[PDB]
Each structure stands twice: as structure tokens, then as C-alpha cells.
């Protein structure tokens, strides 16, 4: 079982990638036990990044670790192809792409052709990044099998039979769940792990839940699962993608800069209110020894 | 943890409840180790039954077992109240209701009032039957807490965190998943069991999966899960509610009559083609000694 | 072109149909220029009614007028058949049915078979009552052509091209939009009229909008359309099916009793708040000489 | 009332904007009676275009006409700001943005701030481009009023009351419908016109339907509307965004090149199949003297 972090992209106030803050974040994540870093995903604002910014994120994180899955997708296939080819110089786990977003009513033929083109040029294993609520399209287990060239899939959806279908129809595929419910997906249900949004700011929890689950300490893991869930709930008050910056700095102790508008940073009063909502949770996790004070 | 069967309602050719076939079905499921029978649920065509017929279903199954949850809901609250009160003289597990179906844009106030009304008159513990896809409404963990009188919930939805939420916010509530993925909901994930529609025609498979999972035999349980999912898949070819009758006759060896139109029965040709699709699953299940030839 | 009123069903405090209030209501609507009365529709709480209650509505309104479309649908096809046959003794415009509701993933074949079965037994022209938000299913122009036997369709959907499609694919079909926008649907855009929710409580407004629209007095018609839309939005604050009762009493001056729970009646405070939100609209309609002081 | 064409972006075989083909297309659209050209819209593959390409599109079309609405939106608000400011030296109708796409559960506050930031920097009127099925978010009349700085709205949605709401709550706002039903939106129902995808390839049909509708020749208008609808239906066979290129070349007589993958071009077989679908429509339009042979 593996935990994969869809890593946040920190931006400066000039709205450029803060390479040094991203280096520090990646270091802390690997040191806290995260298995792999997924770069240019939804949580890292991948669609908000130009192709060159996506590449910059790869380089920054690669200085720290090879354990990278490099998201390269977009609405210009030639750009996605170019990023796939540029990745040949990086000894990483894989590249990935979401399905073409925005456009409604795209044919399965065209969607399949998009992914097969990336497979044909990829110097690395190719991962499906399946996120129907964001992209408007579902590349399900059957379509993945038609595509035939994925080494793995990240199924960002709460429909757990949907995720298990990839394993059933593609037995050699690595299958990761993007469900908020780590306890039921990380271990012991036929999947290879979880892509965990909350691991950016509380990697100790996600990793500890993983261990507890494999040791059969379900009651103990559920308690942390619930704390994790209460943080997620709180992150939605002002917007999860923006709140992830405030929460990471609060729980981990280092700044991550700003998101990219229109993912607007929380202002000082919203940050204050959000910290107030999660301060009791942090005290509990300290009392439990998952976080050092 | 438990397996609850949303039990099929057998109808005769002239569209009457076939009480003797219902009793045979109920006995078989109890004999094979189903824990409770959920009567007048979706799989039993509850919404197609008059309140008179819902009570007759209760009376038929009660001649077999008192391990009954009695679904009484509908769009005439007085009829639901009457069914609840009439259940007084049955030593059963509880009553249940789905949310008011059909009408869109019902206020939360009215939804809460409907359910509190049933609690006030019920002589038994009351179960929430949550099925957003069929009813158009979600009675989520927060709304259930506001209602405040549910002994348990059956959450018929693939969203596994949605189901867990009930336990986090209502720690004394019994929480059952209606997910197709037995292996992640029947044990060791914080839940009390699974309401399994496939358990009508393959109770042995669902009961055995519950055991293998408790015993941590995930590989062996996974193999049965996939076979169960293949049958499920096959049932969608002509319609699951209709097909569940053909499948139960095929896998369990007794006739369950007809569904109620507009849930039309499969014709002779459709039956033959469906059997064709699952005869190899049957054969595999025999070799595994899950079923007898 | 025609205005069709989906007529309210008044109930007594004992939750039985109030025949005398229904007769009074139907009389007023005909007197005010409504062309036809659609009985046991959504606004009449058709799905909350037993087969015998649906028949009682037909009978009460038929004492007043034969300009009736009689909705008979349900999840027990024998009951629908029985109602269709019982309508023979009533010289009305036609019978109608919505698609089978609640049950998801019903096959097109079964949906077609339901409607063709009703056509086979109907002594009258058969109308499609298409309401996909309420039923979960869409019987679109193509499926309607396949069914082959509809004299007309009431398409309750805001998607105006979807409604015109019925005319394009079935040139002999009478086609009525259920859209809130009377101006663009009631006349001069290809359709035969509008099934108008608001017509229960402001029949004068919908008739006058039709006349002005036919006269091409668009500015005048829009002013009324906007006052009508404001009443619609007020009706949704507490639930439009419940507010329809208060609004009919307020604007038409007679009582329509109660809805049937779980369509709960507005409580005293809600009634007061709803009146406050429309009492200026009333004043303006009086000033404009659409309503009587 | 006005017709606005969301103009196609022609690309070369090597995926570069083909400026000369764009100019030829814009010239023909203006010549055939189209009032305004909307550049970098959905039909023009705006989200597939870099900010540099969005500007190049403006520059090409501006050599032909200054009746341009310049779509500038994106997920890097600095790029949108830059494009807005660069537009100062062009005497155009306005700029436009869709809502921030892809990311789900964006707060209203952040959506409002996005649009207000554009208004604060815009040297021109600002248009709301409302396209909820593509963007995942609806900026409805009420939020539009709260944003408070739009000169006009393009409501790409078939819900016609939704579109009218903008005019009701914002009387000075220009309100265009993107619905497929020209005859009910272009004239005489309260709106200022229609943004018509089909106007790229059959501008003659779009302009004549408007003329007929204004003249109140509804039967003649409706007959063209149906022909238009049959082409749109044929364009869905292989994908509308791709089929618009083939249809423009077929009906208008000049090459528009290729779309940008993953909006893949129709291959030679698909083009022939689609032409066979519409050649009867073309001959009919020649017979009606809408098109010259």
C-alpha cells in the first residue's frame, strides 16, 4: 500500500512558482514517509500552469526525489507531447494526464486517441488521472482497457466499485484511490494505495492511518480518519484549494506562499477563522503523539 | 458485521404477490446465513406495492423469520403511519422509510418533518433508507443527526465517505453500506454491514465474502467479489430488477415468479441469453465449492 | 395556442380530496379562460394519489368541464390500465402518463412497452407527460416517435429546443411546453401552448400574457411575465407545491384546503411571509387592471 | 435583435492559427449579415489557445472588422488582465470571460472577485460568457447583478427562463441566448439576440430565420429552423467542434483547415459520411434560395 501526495504548487506574490518553497515541501513530505509525489495535479493547480511551469515543477521536485509522477495533460496535445518527451531526462516513476477538460460531448474515439498519442511518445510509464467531476468525463475501467497502455490509474472519485473495476478488468494495472476515506482504500481492499489531498498538510496522519490499517487497529485508525475528515470539512469553508496553503503552514510550520488567482489566497481574517476551526484538532493530534508540538 | 438482503417480492403471472414463493426464498436466505431481510425495498419493488401489499409482504416473511426490517414509506404519510402502527404486533428488528420520492425541491424542513413523524408513531426502531439516485434526495449524516431518532441507516450509494460520515456524526447509529463493493464494507472499515442486492441470488457468495474478509483472506475474497461483479454486470443487459428473478431461479434452483410491470419480466430469449452469460460463473463457483451442482 | 392548467388537488384536514373546493377551482379557471385542465399532474400531487383518488379527481372536475386531460400513470401498470379503461365513460380530451418513476436504469424497451401498453387499452387520445427531473427519465422526441401513439406531449423542462424536437420529429403531435417562460412558448414559436404552473393562482396573468403575445405587444407581455416570475420565485422560498395553496387563496379569493403530507402545508408564519412578498405584485396587477381590487 | 457568431479558429495541419483563413471566414460572415464576431469562444477553442494565440486571433479578425467581442478568460488571471489591457488600442465591442473552469466547488466570493478584477482593468465593456456545462459553474442573473459591472451576457444554456432572468434583474444589460432555438430567442421574446454556433457554416440560415421571425412569418422560419436542427444533429455524430470545420467548407465553399487536437479533425471517411448526411439539406436550401448552388 502506498500514499501518493498530489503536491501543492507554491506561488510567489508575483504569481511565479516559488521553487525554494516547493523544494522544502517535497523534502518534508518524503521525510514524513510519503511514497510518491504527484506533480501538476488538481491540488497543485496543474490546469492553471503553462507547459513550461509544469516542467519547472518537475525540475524543482526532482532535485529532491526521483519518486515522481509528472502530470502533463492539457488542451493542446502538442504541448502534452513535448512535456512527455522532455521528461526522458528524468528518472521518474511516470507521467500522467487527466482527460481533456472543459469541452462537453467529446467522443470516446477522440478521448482514446488523446491518451494513445501520449502513450506512443512517452519515455516513461503512463498513468491515467481520472477526475470526472473536474474534467467532465469518465475514463472508466472499460475505456482504460480499450486504451490499453496505462501502467496505472489514479481514480479521484468516491465510487469505490468504480475504482475496483480497473483492477478487475486490467489485472496488471496499479490502481490508486483518490477517495477521502483512506481507511477503506489504502490497504486490504485490493487497491495499491491512495492519492491523499490531506497528506500535504497532515502527512503524519495519512501515513499513520496506513500503518494502523495494515496492523488491524481499525478503531485507532478511524479516530484519525475522523480528525482528518474534520480538517477537510473545515477547508471547505473558504475553499479547499486555497485553504490547503494555510493548513500546510499551520500543521507543518513552513510557508507555502500563495495559490494562483482565481484560486485566491485566504485573507488574514479567513486564515484566523480557519486556524480557529482546526486548533482543537491539532491539540488532539499532539496529545496523540502524531504531531510534535 | 452483517449482510442484509433487500429481498425480492415474487409476483404471480396475474400480478399478485406469490406468498408461498416468497416464504421459500426467505427460508433459503436465512438458511444460507443472511442476517436480516429488508422487506419492501427497491429490489422488492416497494414503491410499486400498495400499503396493503407492503403489509402482506411483512406477514409472509414473518412466517419464516422475525429478522425483518419493514420498509413502510410512501407519498401518503397517513399510509406510512398506519403501516408503522400495524407493525406493533410483529417482533421484528425495525421499520424503515426512504425519503419522499418523485417531487423535486422538497425543503429540508418537510423532509425532516416526514421522518420525525414516523419516529413519533413507530413501535420499533426506525431505519433511514437513503437512496439518492432513486428518490432524488439525500438524507446525509447531518440531516440524519437533525432528525435525531434513527436507530440506523442503509446508505445505498457508492460514495463510501458519505456512508462513514453517518458514523462520525452519529456514533451510536448502526450504519450499513449499499455499495456493490462488499469486500470494503462488510468488515474492518467502521461499518456494521452491507445491504447486498446480489445476496438474493448468490447469498453464499456474499456470506462467504464476509467471512474471508473477517479472516483477512483478501485474495480469495477478491476473486469472489469479481465474480459477483460479473453477475451484476450481466444483470444490467436487460435490466437488473427484472434480471434478479432469472438469476435467483438459476443460481438457487427455485422459481420466484414475475416482477411487476413496468418492471417487465425477461422473455424466454432474454432469459436464455442472460443464463449464457453467467453459466461459466456458475461453473466456477461450483469448482470453488461455494455452490453445489 | 392554449393554456393548460395542471390543476391543484385540494385535500381536507382528514387528508381526503375536497370535491367541492376542486369543483369551485375548476369553475373559476374555466371562467377565466383556461383552455384545458390537466388532472393528477405533478402540481395536483398525482403520484401521491391512489388509483381511486385519481378517478375521484376526474369525476369532480368532469362535473364542471369535459376539457380534461386525465393523468393515470403509476408503477402498477394494471392500475394504470384500469384507469384508462374507466375513462371510457368520460368524454374528455385524453389520458396522460408520466414515465415510470423512482427506479433508475430502466431499459428503453421497458419504457416503450409501458407506454404502448397504455395506448393499446386507451379509449382516448394518449398524451406524454414528460418530466425528467421528477421521474429520472426523459422520453424525448425520438423515443416518443418510436412509441408511435401519442396524440400530444407536455414537455416540462426549461430546454426549449428539446420541446421543439417533438414537433420536428412528430409533425402531427400536439406539443406543449411546461417552461416557466410563457412569452417564448405559448405563441409564435412552433408550439401549441403551455402547461402553466402559475395558472392555478394567476390564470388572468397567463391568459393575458398569451393574448398580448399573440398581439405582438411584447413589452407589455414581458412586464406581466416578470411579475409572474417574481411570484414563482416567492413560491419556492417555502416549497412551490405547498405555496400554490396559499397563493391561490390570496389571489383568487377562495380556499383550496391543504396539500397532502409530506407535501406539508405552509405554517402560519410562512404564509404571512409569502403574502408579504407578493402583496405588492398583487397591488400592481390590480393597478394594471389584470386582477380585481 | 442581433446574431453573434462564436467564430471558429482555423488551424494549419501543423497546429498553428491559420490567420488568412480566419480573415476569409470573418469577411464572409460579415458579408452574409452577421452582426458581431465573438473570438476565442468555445467554438473557437478558446481554452485550447495560449494567451499569445488569443491575441493573435483578435489581431487577425480586427483586420476585417471591429465588431468583435474579445474573450480573454483563463486560469491565470494575470494573463487575462494582460489581454484585457492589450485590447485598449483596438476599437472593439468588448471583452468577455467564461467563469474559471475545471476546479469544482469554487466559492462565489472567488468567482465574483475574478470577474470584478477583470472589470477594474478593462478598457472596454465586459461581457459575461455563461457556459455552465463547460465550466462547471453558473454565474446566474443574481450573481451577475452582484458582480454589477457587466455590459452584456451570453447565456449558453437551453434553459430560456434562466436567460430571461438576466434581463429581469439587470434591465440595462444586453442579454444574448446561446440556445439552439433561434426562432424563440433571436427576436420578440425579450432578449437582444442569439450567439449561434451554427452561424459559422450557415449564416444565411441564421440571418433569414431572424428576418422571418421579425416579419412574423413563423411557418417559413420554422422550416429553416428544422433544417438547421438537422445539421446540428448530424454534426453530433462525430463531434460538433470538429464537424463545424467540414460543414463550413461544405456549405460556404472555402477551407477552414483543422481543429487543435484533442479536438481532432474528422478523417476523410467521417467527412464523407457527414456530407452524405447533409447534402439533402444543402439541395433543399438551394431550392428555397437561401443558398446559391
From Swiss-Prot, chains A, B, C, D:
UniProt keyword Disulfide bond, yes or no: no
Coiled coil stretches, renumbered: none
Enzyme Commission code: 4.1.2.55
Site (Proton shuttle): 129
Disulphide bridges, residue numbers: none
Note: The metabolic pathway in Sulfolobus species contrasts with the situation observed in other microorganisms where separate enzymes exist for the catabolism of the two sugars, glucose and galactose.
Lineage: Archaea, Thermoproteota, Thermoprotei, Sulfolobales, Sulfolobaceae
Listed pathway(s): Carbohydrate acid metabolism; 2-dehydro-3-deoxy-D-gluconate degradation; D-glyceraldehyde 3-phosphate and pyruvate from 2-dehydro-3-deoxy-D-gluconate: step 2/2
Temperature dependence: Extremely thermostable.
SUPFAM superfamilies: Aldolase (SSF51569)
Organism: Saccharolobus solfataricus
Swiss-Prot/TrEMBL keywords: Carbohydrate metabolism, Lyase, Schiff base
Keyword flag Magnesium: no
Protein family per UniProt: Belongs to the DapA family. KDPG aldolase subfamily.
InterPro entries according to UniProt: Aldolase_TIM, DapA-like, ED_pathway_aldolase
Protein purpose: Involved in the degradation of glucose and galactose via the Entner-Doudoroff pathway. Catalyzes the reversible cleavage of 2-keto-3-deoxy-6-phosphogluconate (KDPG) and 2-keto-3-deoxygluconate (KDG) forming pyruvate and glyceraldehyde 3-phosphate or glyceraldehyde, respectively. It is also able to catalyze the reversible cleavage of 2-keto-3-deoxy-6-phosphogalactonate (KDPGal) and 2-keto-3-deoxygalactonate (KDGal). It is equally active with both D- and L-glyceraldehyde.
One Pfam match: DHDPS
Protein name: 2-dehydro-3-deoxy-phosphogluconate/2-dehydro-3-deoxy-6-phosphogalactonate aldolase
Catalytic activity: 2-dehydro-3-deoxy-6-phospho-D-gluconate = D-glyceraldehyde 3-phosphate + pyruvate; 2-dehydro-3-deoxy-6-phospho-D-galactonate = D-glyceraldehyde 3-phosphate + pyruvate
Class in the EC hierarchy, top level: lyase
Source taxon at top rank: Archaea
GO molecular-function terms, A-Z: 2-dehydro-3-deoxy-6-phosphogalactonate aldolase activity; 2-dehydro-3-deoxy-phosphogluconate aldolase activity; 4-hydroxy-tetrahydrodipicolinate synthase activity
Amino acid at each position: 500500500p502506498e500514499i501518493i501526495t498530489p503536491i501543492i504548487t507554491p506561488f510567489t506574490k508575483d504569481n511565479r512558482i516559488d521553487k525554494e518553497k516547493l523544494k522544502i515541501h517535497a523534502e518534508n513530505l518524503i521525510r514524513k514517509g510519503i511514497d510518491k509525489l504527484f506533480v501538476n495535479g488538481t491540488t497543485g493547480l496543474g490546469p492553471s500552469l503553462s507547459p513550461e511551469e509544469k516542467l519547472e515543477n518537475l525540475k524543482a521536485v526532482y532535485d529532491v526525489t526521483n519518486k515522481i509522477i509528472f502530470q502533463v495533460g492539457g488542451l493542446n496535445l502538442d504541448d502534452a507531447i513535448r512535456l512527455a518527451k522532455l521528461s526522458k531526462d528524468f528518472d521518474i516513476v511516470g507521467i500522467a494526464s487527466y482527460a481533456p477538460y472543459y469541452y462537453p460531448r467529446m467522443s470516446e474515439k477522440h478521448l482514446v486517441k488523446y491518451f494513445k498519442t501520449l502513450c506512443e511518445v512517452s519515455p516513461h510509464p503512463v498513468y491515467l488521472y481520472n477526475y470526472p467531476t473536474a474534467t467532465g468525463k469518465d475514463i472508466d475501467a472499460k475505456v482504460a482497457k480499450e486504451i490499453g497502455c496505462f501502467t496505472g490509474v489514479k481514480d479521484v472519485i468516491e465510487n469505490i466499485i468504480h475504482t475496483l473495476d480497473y483492477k478487475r478488468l486490467n489485472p496488471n494495472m496499479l490502481v490508486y484511490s483518490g477517495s477521502q476515506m483512506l481507511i477503506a482504500t489504502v490497504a486490504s481492499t485490493g487497491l495499491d494505495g491512495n492519492v491523499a489531498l490531506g497528506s500535504n498538510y497532515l502527512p503524519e496522519v495519512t501515513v499513520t492511518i496506513k500503518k494502523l490499517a495494515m496492523e488491524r487497529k481499525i478503531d485507532e485508525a478511524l479516530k484519525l480518519q475522523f480528525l482528518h475528515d474534520e480538517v477537510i470539512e473545515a477547508s471547505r469553508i473558504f475553499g479547499s484549494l486555497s485553504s490547503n496553503y494555510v493548513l500546510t503552514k499551520y500543521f507543518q510550520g513552513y510557508d507555502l506562499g500563495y495559490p494562483r488567482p482565481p484560486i485566491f489566497p485566504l485573507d488574514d481574517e479567513e486564515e484566523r477563522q480557519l486556524i480557529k476551526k482546526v486548533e482543537g484538532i491539532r491539540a488532539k493530534l499532539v496529545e496523540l503523539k502524531i504531531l510534535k508540538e
